[PDB]
Homo-oligomer: A and B are copies of this chain.
């Protein structure tokens, strides 16, 4: 259960880097930057699934990490 906290920490740090990419797109005023984010979202989903499988992170924590970014990603397209 020491592993659980460290895992949760790394995962959130990793989601934060992607979130920053989304937020910087929103805080400013293309073309298919959607392709880039989809790959980033896929990469983090795989980290999340990997951690959920090993019981390092709870299923709902993983779901909350993904939801937080997906909510923000929705506001991006739109245009």
**Inter-subunit contact B54/A3 (CB<8 Å):** yes
Find the B residue at minimum CB distance from A43. B46
**Bound CA–CA A11/B43 (angstroms):** 14
Query: Which secondary structure dominates where chain A touches chain B?
Result: helix
**Bound CA–CA A6/B50 (angstroms):** 11
Question: Which A residues contact B (CB, under 8 angstroms)?
Answer: 3, 6-7, 10-11, 14, 39, 42-47, 50-51, 53-54, 56
Closest 9 CB pairs of A and B: A43-B46, A47-B50, A46-B47, A46-B46, A43-B43, A42-B43, A6-B54, A39-B42, A10-B53
Known: A3-B3, A10-B50, A44-B46. 14 other contacts (CB 8 A): A3-B54, A6-B54, A10-B54, A11-B50, A14-B50, A39-B42, A42-B42, A42-B43, A43-B43, A46-B46, A46-B47, A47-B47, A50-B50, A50-B51
